[PDB]
Amino acid sequence: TRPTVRPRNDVAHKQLSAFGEYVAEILPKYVQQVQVSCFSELEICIHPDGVIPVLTFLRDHSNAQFKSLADLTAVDIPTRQNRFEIVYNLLSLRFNSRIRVKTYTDELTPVESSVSVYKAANWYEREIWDMFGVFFANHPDLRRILTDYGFEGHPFRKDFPLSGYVELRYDDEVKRVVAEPVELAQEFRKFDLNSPWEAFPAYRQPPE
């Protein structure tokens, strides 16, 4: 398994497991799950009410010092009743490490904003509200950031179609750019590329 297989890191896996135990034991009020992946990445899944305390602890603790917020993302998984999974990626320059903090919310429940901890969260969760419709309570200035000014609907949700519901064209009668119901000269062709055979037995789900 030498030339064509990715070498495995075990010291980092042990250190990340120990730090996951450390965090999940310091904060039992919000932490629900702690896992470490195959490629040595630590994910801490927490309750949505403890977004501010967990992030402030990870930012300010002497043994954490996660001073950088790299990326803030939402993921749309429609089969869950809390379909939106909000993911914080943090970087610690003191210990040269990275962590992942995950929480959940649905369409109608707001999430506490983390601008008071990290200042990149302003534009990041403004984009999250724009694309997934997740409201962030106690935000300084929450509006749209990437979509059109009159756009209706959140495009990164999975029930939103690839091509939207409206399209723009210039009309000479009103001398203006107008929005009309979408009609495609060629329909986007859907491809069924999924193999009917199981690829990875290690990820096999148990039957009902």
Which residues of the shown chain bind other proteins in the complex (CB under 8 A)? 78-81, 107-110, 133, 135, 137, 142-144, 148-154, 157-165, 171, 173-174, 176-199, 201, 204-207
* C-beta closer to other proteins: residue 16 or 111: 111
Pick the closest to residue 94 from 50, 127, 63 (CA basis).
63
Q: Least Å distance between CB 203 and other proteins? A: 12
Pick the closest to residue 161 from 187, 142, 141, 185 (CA basis).
187
Round to whole Å and give the CA distance between 15 and 184: 54
Q: Least Å distance between CB 90 and other proteins? A: 25
* C-beta closer to other proteins: residue 11 or 199: 199
Q: Do 112 and 52 meet the contact criterion of CB atoms below 8 Å apart?
A: yes
Q: How many CB atoms lie within 10 A of CB 53?
A: 15
* C-beta closer to other proteins: residue 25 or 180: 180
Q: Least Å distance between CB 143 and other proteins? A: 5
Q: Least Å distance between CB 73 and other proteins? A: 20
Q: Is 184 exposed, middle or buried (0-12, 13-18, 19+ CB in 10 A)?
A: exposed
* C-beta closer to other proteins: residue 61 or 158: 158
Round to whole Å and give the CA distance between 114 and 120: 9
* C-beta closer to other proteins: residue 71 or 180: 180
* C-beta closer to other proteins: residue 70 or 166: 166
The residue type at 149: Y
Can you give 77-127 as a three-state secondary structure string? CCCCCCCEEEEEEEEECCCCEEEEEEEEECCCCCEECCCCCCCCHHHHHHH
